[PDB]
Design a protein around this nucleic acid. Structure first.
Length: 52
RNA sequence: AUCCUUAUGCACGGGAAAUACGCAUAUCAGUGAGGAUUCGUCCGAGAUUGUGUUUUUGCUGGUUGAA
């Protein structure tokens, strides 16, 4: 009686606090190139405007 | 702390080319694009279509003429 034979326990499964390591999203070479092209282009444009 | 590898970002410098370099509310693409081959197999990343410039873009200097 003091420990019941009848019941089956389903105790709370303790979830471990997994540290969210934000994933290093990489770039394709092409993507990188595009980025380089665009930022640089923008800079150039700015220079032109700020020199014209 | 010193030395080195990789990638990238910024730049000195040097070189080549622009028939080249993009762009896309496109279509498809390592769940295979496109290729090789001694035929056993092998390489493996763009291809298609559309389109913008492309004997050139942006800026300077000179002589000159113009008169």
């Amino acid at each position: 009686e003091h420990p019941s034979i009848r019941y089956v326990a389903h105790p709370l499964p303790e979830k471990i606090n997994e540290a969210k390591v934000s994933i290093k999203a990489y770039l394709t070479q092409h993507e990188r190139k595009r980025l380089r092209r665009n930022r640089r282009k923008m800079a150039r444009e700015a220079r032109e405007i700020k020199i014209k």
